[PDB]
């Protein structure tokens with residue numbers, strides 16, 4: 001027996017979050033939740049949706065987040081998506097930062113869809129990223145912030161892909177054929193974080209690619225309850241819209257009942 005809560009009213013907003021419909025671009029969707037709309041190239045912008053219930057890493061879970069990326073090159077667009085687990089909260093994230101850059105909240109960890117060429121970790125041509133500038137190309141990976149806040153790449157590269165680089169994600173294209181069957185990252189697509197307590201492993205699925213990390217890789221203490229944040233950010237000194245969207249009705253947190 002499992003239970004599923006959906007986003008809708010089970011998330012609290014922190015920082016640069018608005019909820020509105022996009023009837024021209026997403027006519028089948030209802031109210032979408034948008035990060036980074038509050039343009040300011042002085043400061044950049046960030047936001048986090050904090051799940052109102054705790055995550056228990058002694059029990060299985062599956063978290064599904066529909067995301068739609070900015071149709072924007074990796075030097076001008078948003079940093080990406082940080083699916084963070086932390087004993088800290090959204091307020092801390094606004095004050096200390098997240099998992100999408102080189103430094104954020106101490107001990108925060110989780111899965112990132114990195115959609116920006118901005119940091120030394122982005123520099124890894126073998127594993128992560130070799131197309132820079134106009135390319136709507138990024139990469140996925142688990143990351144852990146250390147005790148010092150520094151973000152490290154952890155866990156496995158993508159399983160059984162032939163892509164080069166192995167962690168590559170083409171996070172957007174200009175397609176008008178949204179229901180091609182091909183992956184179109186600017187449309188809504190599920191990120192699935194499956195956690196198997198028996199193997200202490202989170203599997204992340206996005207764009208038909210799979211990553212895994214253990215709780216040990218993420219520095220997660222299974223005895224402690226964690227908060228779950230969906231985060232995005234857009235750098236200072238980026239003159240673009242870096243708008244990153246989710247459908248909070250499509251956000252599902254499934255756990256065993258006990």
Ligand SMILES: [Ca+2]
Pocket residue numbers: 079100101114115116117118119122
């Ligand atoms: Ca990056």
